[PDB]
Enzyme design. Structure first.
Site, short mmCIF file in Angstrom:
data_model
loop_
_atom_site.label_atom_id
_atom_site.label_comp_id
_atom_site.label_asym_id
_atom_site.label_seq_id
_atom_site.Cartn_x
_atom_site.Cartn_y
_atom_site.Cartn_z
CE1 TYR A 83 -0.89 0.63 8.06
CE2 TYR A 83 0.28 2.69 7.56
CZ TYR A 83 0.23 1.30 7.55
OH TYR A 83 1.26 0.59 7.03
CE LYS A 123 1.34 1.31 4.08
NZ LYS A 123 2.13 2.57 4.16
N1 LIG Z 1 2.04 -1.97 5.10
C1 LIG Z 1 3.04 -1.55 5.85
O1 LIG Z 1 3.09 -1.64 7.06
C2 LIG Z 1 4.23 -0.90 5.09
C3 LIG Z 1 4.21 -0.78 3.68
N2 LIG Z 1 5.33 -0.18 3.05
C4 LIG Z 1 5.28 -0.08 1.59
O2 LIG Z 1 6.36 -0.86 0.97
C5 LIG Z 1 6.77 -0.22 -0.24
C6 LIG Z 1 8.29 -0.02 -0.23
O3 LIG Z 1 8.66 1.01 0.70
P1 LIG Z 1 9.86 0.79 1.74
O4 LIG Z 1 10.33 -0.63 1.86
O5 LIG Z 1 9.55 1.38 3.03
O6 LIG Z 1 10.95 1.66 1.09
P2 LIG Z 1 12.45 1.45 0.54
O7 LIG Z 1 12.93 2.76 0.03
O8 LIG Z 1 13.29 1.03 1.68
O9 LIG Z 1 12.56 0.38 -0.62
C7 LIG Z 1 12.05 0.55 -1.94
C8 LIG Z 1 12.47 -0.73 -2.70
O10 LIG Z 1 12.00 -0.69 -4.05
C9 LIG Z 1 13.07 -0.86 -5.00
N3 LIG Z 1 13.13 0.25 -5.96
C10 LIG Z 1 13.07 0.16 -7.33
N4 LIG Z 1 13.16 1.39 -7.89
C11 LIG Z 1 13.28 2.23 -6.87
C12 LIG Z 1 13.40 3.61 -6.91
N5 LIG Z 1 13.42 4.27 -8.05
N6 LIG Z 1 13.52 4.30 -5.71
C13 LIG Z 1 13.51 3.64 -4.54
N7 LIG Z 1 13.39 2.29 -4.50
C14 LIG Z 1 13.27 1.55 -5.66
C15 LIG Z 1 14.36 -1.07 -4.20
O11 LIG Z 1 14.87 -2.41 -4.35
P3 LIG Z 1 16.47 -2.89 -4.48
O12 LIG Z 1 17.20 -1.98 -3.49
O13 LIG Z 1 16.73 -4.16 -4.05
O14 LIG Z 1 17.02 -2.48 -5.91
C16 LIG Z 1 14.00 -0.85 -2.74
O15 LIG Z 1 14.37 -1.94 -1.91
C17 LIG Z 1 5.97 1.10 -0.32
O16 LIG Z 1 4.84 0.93 -1.24
C18 LIG Z 1 5.49 1.33 1.12
O17 LIG Z 1 4.30 2.14 1.17
C19 LIG Z 1 6.47 0.30 3.79
C20 LIG Z 1 6.49 0.19 5.19
C21 LIG Z 1 5.36 -0.42 5.84
#
Ligand SMILES: NC(=O)C1=CN([C@@H]2O[C@H](COP(=O)(O)OP(=O)(O)OC[C@H]3O[C@@H](n4cnc5c(N)ncnc54)[C@H](OP(=O)(O)O)[C@@H]3O)[C@@H](O)[C@H]2O)C=CC1
Ligand SMILES: NC(=O)C1=CN([C@@H]2O[C@H](COP(=O)(O)OP(=O)(O)OC[C@H]3O[C@@H](n4cnc5c(N)ncnc54)[C@H](OP(=O)(O)O)[C@@H]3O)[C@@H](O)[C@H]2O)C=CC1
Ligand SMILES: NC(=O)C1=CN([C@@H]2O[C@H](COP(=O)(O)OP(=O)(O)OC[C@H]3O[C@@H](n4cnc5c(N)ncnc54)[C@H](OP(=O)(O)O)[C@@H]3O)[C@@H](O)[C@H]2O)C=CC1
Ligand SMILES: NC(=O)C1=CN([C@@H]2O[C@H](COP(=O)(O)OP(=O)(O)OC[C@H]3O[C@@H](n4cnc5c(N)ncnc54)[C@H](OP(=O)(O)O)[C@@H]3O)[C@@H](O)[C@H]2O)C=CC1
EC number: 1.1.99.28
Lengths: 381, 381, 381, 381
Positions: free
Chosen positions: C217, C129
């Site tokens: 949320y 989300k």
């Molecule tokens: N439901 C919940 O409780 C939560 C949901 N989320 C959701 O998870 C998703 C990811 O966010 P989150 O893990 O916090 O954030 P991060 O910034 O830590 O990670 C984003 C991931 O997406 C990939 N990616 C590909 N292109 C991009 C780009 N252009 N810029 C940044 N990242 C890119 C990367 O993979 P790689 O590094 O391996 O190349 C990276 O690991 C979001 O949609 C967020 O809303 C986040 C926290 C909690």
């Protein structure tokens, strides 16, 4: 679509209205007049100010040995200066029909004496706890009570505390299931600098240490929470040998008991640790935790089961029941007026004393003491 | 090894002792005499009984339109029957030197009238909130106050509540860091059957709905918690069109505000949901949660950070500060005696009213209303 | 009295015993194979370590843009090094039958595209989300799900959290009475130096600020707690113009919503105040307070009424339900293996996005935005 | 005002990113290989599923007496089916270098023997509590550890639980002042139909009742909280003579202990009352209440003083420390890989057993039992 009758009928101009809904105990009358004996810490901090919320009790006279002080208090509470008695002319209260009872708030070793004298003066008696410093003295107070044909109530404020009664009620409704383990702790740091605590360090006046002063809450609480008396007690006590506070009276003391139902308990009282008032009642269906348990204010009780904690405490806007202090005072007043017995009679006060002596005895001998002497709670816990 | 002097010097015989340590506000004098106007729900449930714990205030006279009732209350509080005034001879109080002030506890639409009349009668004025039903009426009360050269205090009990002041204090010490979001909710179920609530459904008397009656706590609380005034407000309000209770006054209403510091807030008041009194103050270093927030009793505050919840509430055995009710009454008394201004002056009462009108306006138009009119809190929040 | 058969029938010697009782979720199989896209903060802090507790799920392969990182991770979770994809050959997953679904944990802007691509790879899609940064994109992802004829589930863990589930159950059981006011707040201090937070500051990648990330949320919650959709909404947003963090996205935004049942709500989200996750549901019988309302761990709910606080939380020794994460995972696994619809379909994630765009509009235009578009929660909240 | 370098430097396209921040324990390696003996309730409900969170531990092999069960388990945790031992060929583990230590999770009577056997198999021993049912057996296990020159660690998870660790830290920081009274209670309703509870009813396999199984928490706790050993102890025990469950082992037993510092304690354990795990440490500055005190999850501690309650618990989004189980496991792994002594050596488990036998004696004899035998907590509590 339209406003209900009531609202629609309210004048827009200043007009007399009805008696309002009562969300808290309203005053009623002041027919039962007390004479307070001993203008001390508990008297001026809790009792005197506790009269305001009474629905039947009032302060008629004061009995003190400190002329200057009585004077001040008298003026503070609207008491007629002529109603100030000292410990000598105390017995003259017998000539004042406006004095229905006395409320003895003197150090423990003096309760018996004034309870009796009050009775001979034809007055009812409210006496603080611990009742007296000896079982015999408790019995003499009872005797004198029967002789004057007057009531004898011991100041057990917890027997008139909303949360405590709430706790007693949930146990009786079997929300805890079969009861098996009761834990208690009552402590507060002893300050020899405080005038009220100075006689509490004297065995001759206090009759004992932390058990006589505050342990009594865990002991008494253990009893009305379980709804029965113990058949045997065991106990151990210790006090730092270098602490000047405990030369004559005990600081810390632990005592465990067994009841005829099978339940057990282990409590303690302390004069060297900070504020603690916590009761625990383990049943096989739930566990009750009272903390604060015996406070002057802010009591809180919680029933716990895995994943749950249902708490209870006084409400934020409504006051369903009167506060323990006012309730207690009105309790003796009502009992006299309605010719009924008090829930906290001398026999009850004596039961705690005998009980304590037994605990001190089990502490001294290191052996268990049988307390299966058939005390029966008249009226219920 | 041995008992300290103090304990060692205590007589074993009944003897006068010193003044005890005071663990709670002790009475002192009753020099400031009040005249209560309107023997209603809040008067008989909270205020009258609140006089007992005053260190300077007393009840001198009663002003009611219900002869039978005044009579009863008079006897209940020791007031001389001769000091019973009705809404007609009200102005005669000007002949009684023993009446220093009046305490207006009448429905909202009548405050202004009696505040002024009281002033013309040369008396100080304690007036309940909401101050009046119009900004202009607030100003007229202020004017009259200045004309008689008398104090004008609005009944903001939370400005004299230990826990609230405790909350204001921790915020000022920056325990929450920079403040950014304040949330509030104040609700209780409206019962048209209750005499006190019947005029609250009448717009002409109440001056409004849940916002004028209880929303005002979130609004006012938001202000002293942040320590500043809002520069703009927005609001929306809704009430079931079929509910007879809300034909003239609003049931539920929401309002968000922005302050000159950047903080924002979103609160609400409700007449159709059960008891709620909860304030939330988000800083970037911590979050404060008050719940109960504005109760008559049992307030509880907690400062939360990941893995922690430091709670605060009144103690179990000591009463560090006087209760809001008694504090409030003594506050005007002290201000007169020491020639000092009150912390809850008419200007303060007027600020809430203007503020509310703005919120109602933003609700009606659906547009934001600028409230950056430079109100300045004299004395501090 | 003699020990039961079972007790006395135990060998005092090393012998085999039956399968012990299960006081917490037991592992079963690993039928389902997941391909996690984007090895970020959530993916490595909560999701991956959450498979361990699953009952029907396994990490079959990874999809990373940082090979070096994906090699280290693949090791820690023992994934086949030969199964470490990249955003280029991501489509080749369609050649591995051991990959049943993929879990897109990428920035909001890259959600839709990798969902549609994965659907052509004939795989099931678990998408975090918010669903996407466009209602249309949401719609396309759906269409691409029907086409490929696969399952589309959004990462709403709160839909699988015990306490959140307990909250809905008591409300559905009418414990609060007639629902009338909901208050939600979500917040956490935005750290721009955090690699994960850097794309959230970019409105092209995030698609919004505060609301799109955590306010959702409160928005979602309000919806399943109440168990109905808003028909109208209003909102306001504000951010410090000098803060480099909110040059493109909103810091704090407040939204008010009205529901068909007549219930109202007001909630907010913040990027500049510390940790806050609190839900408040007001009924006419009781008030529910979730706080923590939506955490990874330690959720806490309480049902309040005057004098009572009935709190619920996860037991301390048992575990009646599995953690939200492992429960969310297996929920897709079970959804397919039983030809049953998922509780968090793409149609559910779409509603939140339409509602958010509606809010942003209300805030931007400053007017009400009718959201009464006939959505229906297929399967219930 | 412009976005920071990092924000504007993020690709609006699928690109790789750095290693995200760790807000909870991250997996690293699996250097250590464990051989879990006895696939029982604890082994399958808490221990095995706790390896997933380890950082340096893995399940290398199993030891079961029920092959059928061990095959199903081996599957669930993916252990090599060829590595499923039995109590006969248990010694053959000495031939596998992939097995560094074994985890004995067997009845108390079978603890020592499998520890000594494992030591000859040149493996490290993780043995559950109580160490053994004899002080001598405890001693032999030790001797067999020095001989084989391996590590001997007892399963005291509380020694690795965040909150329990937080409790010790604040006490060591003198937040409670001079410690003077400790109160502990542990309980849970004994279910004889539970395969796991059936050997606990047998005194030959259990070596005791209530105390040996859960009272040991209170006993152990009191010791690390206070940070000193008892020099004298008293105790009493009682069990319903008609209950088939306590024909050989004690149901409820209460013990009082005195410490060198002068501190005292009173604690109890029960088999007939529902879930209870509460610690109370009383000092002269504040009182600490752990409740839950020693659960698998959801521990809670509070520091109390008049008017305040400062509660601590695990955060709701972060995880500063790993769970007691995974922490206990890796603690042995790290103990060896660093040539560092373990915090819970066998010498620590031995003290609890000597102390328990001393208590049973005090209860049996009804007299004080000097436990002042110069034990020393190597490494600190
Ligand atoms: N439901 C919940 O409780 C939560 C949901 N989320 C959701 O998870 C998703 C990811 O966010 P989150 O893990 O916090 O954030 P991060 O910034 O830590 O990670 C984003 C991931 O997406 C990939 N990616 C590909 N292109 C991009 C780009 N252009 N810029 C940044 N990242 C890119 C990367 O993979 P790689 O590094 O391996 O190349 C990276 O690991 C979001 O949609 C967020 O809303 C986040 C926290 C909690
Ligand atoms: N139920 C409850 O919650 C509590 C009950 N109590 C009980 O109230 C009683 C009074 O204790 P408390 O008010 O705390 O103590 P104080 O020491 O403060 O007062 C005792 C009072 O008795 C009078 N007195 C007469 N002779 C003596 C003497 N020789 N030594 C000391 N006092 C004497 C004095 O009255 P004067 O100076 O006016 O002549 C004095 O003020 C005790 O029996 C105590 O157990 C106390 C606290 C709480
Ligand atoms: N600060 C706080 O916590 C609270 C403040 N208040 C405030 O106190 C004031 C009084 O409200 P409350 O006590 O609850 O209400 P009530 O309705 O119970 O009483 C109003 C009183 O004013 C008098 N009165 C004169 N004319 C009228 C009239 N036309 N209609 C109704 N009453 C009339 C009556 O006195 P009599 O019969 O004796 O002639 C009546 O008892 C209000 O302004 C309210 O906002 C109320 C609750 C709490
Ligand atoms: N520290 C903590 O929090 C806890 C520690 N424990 C400790 O773990 C140990 C095991 O107890 P627990 O798992 O609860 O109990 P269980 O009865 O469930 O399991 C005992 C295990 O030991 C093996 N075993 C070998 N011989 C016997 C025998 N004669 N009778 C019974 N079992 C035998 C069995 O293995 P198999 O079936 O595979 O043949 C069985 O799995 C105890 O020392 C206990 O005190 C328990 C709970 C919590």
């Amino acid at each position: 679509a339209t406003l209900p009758a009531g609202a629609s009928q309210v004048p827009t101009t200043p007009a007399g209205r009805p008696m309002p809904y009562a969300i808290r105990p309203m005053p009623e009358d002041r027919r039962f007049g007390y004479a307070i004996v001993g203008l001390g810490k508990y008297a001026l901090n809790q009792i005197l100010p506790g009269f305001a919320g009474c629905q039947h009790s009032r302060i008629e006279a004061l009995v003190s040995g400190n002329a200057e002080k009585a004077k001040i208090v008298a003026a503070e509470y609207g008491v007629d200066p002529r109603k100030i008695y000292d410990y000598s002319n105390f017995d003259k209260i017998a000539k004042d029909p406006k004095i229905d009872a006395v409320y003895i708030i003197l150090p423990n070793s003096l309760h018996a004496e004034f309870a009796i004298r009050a009775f001979k003066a034809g007055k009812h008696v409210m006496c603080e706890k611990p009742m007296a410093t000896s079982v015999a003295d408790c019995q003499r107070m009872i005797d004198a009570a029967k002789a004057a044909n007057k009531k004898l109530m011991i100041g057990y404020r917890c027997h008139y505390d909303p949360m405590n009664r709430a706790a007693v009620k949930l146990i009786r409704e079997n929300q805890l299931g079969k009861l098996g383990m009761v834990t208690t702790d009552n402590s507060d740091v002893m300050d020899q600098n405080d005038p009220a605590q100075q006689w509490r360090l004297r065995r001759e006046l206090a009759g004992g240490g932390s058990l006589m002063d505050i342990g009594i809450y865990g002991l008494n609480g253990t009893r009305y929470l379980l709804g029965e008396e113990p058949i045997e007690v065991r106990a151990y006590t210790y006090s730092d040998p270098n602490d000047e506070r405990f030369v004559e009276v005990e600081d810390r003391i632990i005592w465990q008991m067994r009841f005829r139902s099978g339940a057990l308990s282990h409590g303690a009282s302390s004069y060297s640790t900070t504020t603690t008032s916590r009761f625990s009642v383990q049943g096989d269906k739930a566990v009750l935790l009272m903390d604060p348990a015996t406070g002057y204010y802010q009591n809180l009780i919680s029933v716990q089961t895995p994943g749950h904690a249902n708490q209870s405490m006084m409400p934020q806007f409504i006051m369903p029941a009167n506060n323990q202090f006012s309730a207690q005072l009105d309790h003796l007043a009502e009992a006299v007026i309605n010719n009924k017995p008090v829930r906290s009679p001398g026999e009850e006060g004596m039961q705690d004393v005998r009980l304590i002596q037994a605990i001190y005895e089990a502490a001294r001998t290191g052996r268990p003491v049988n307390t299966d002497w058939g005390y029966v709670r008249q009226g219920g816990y």
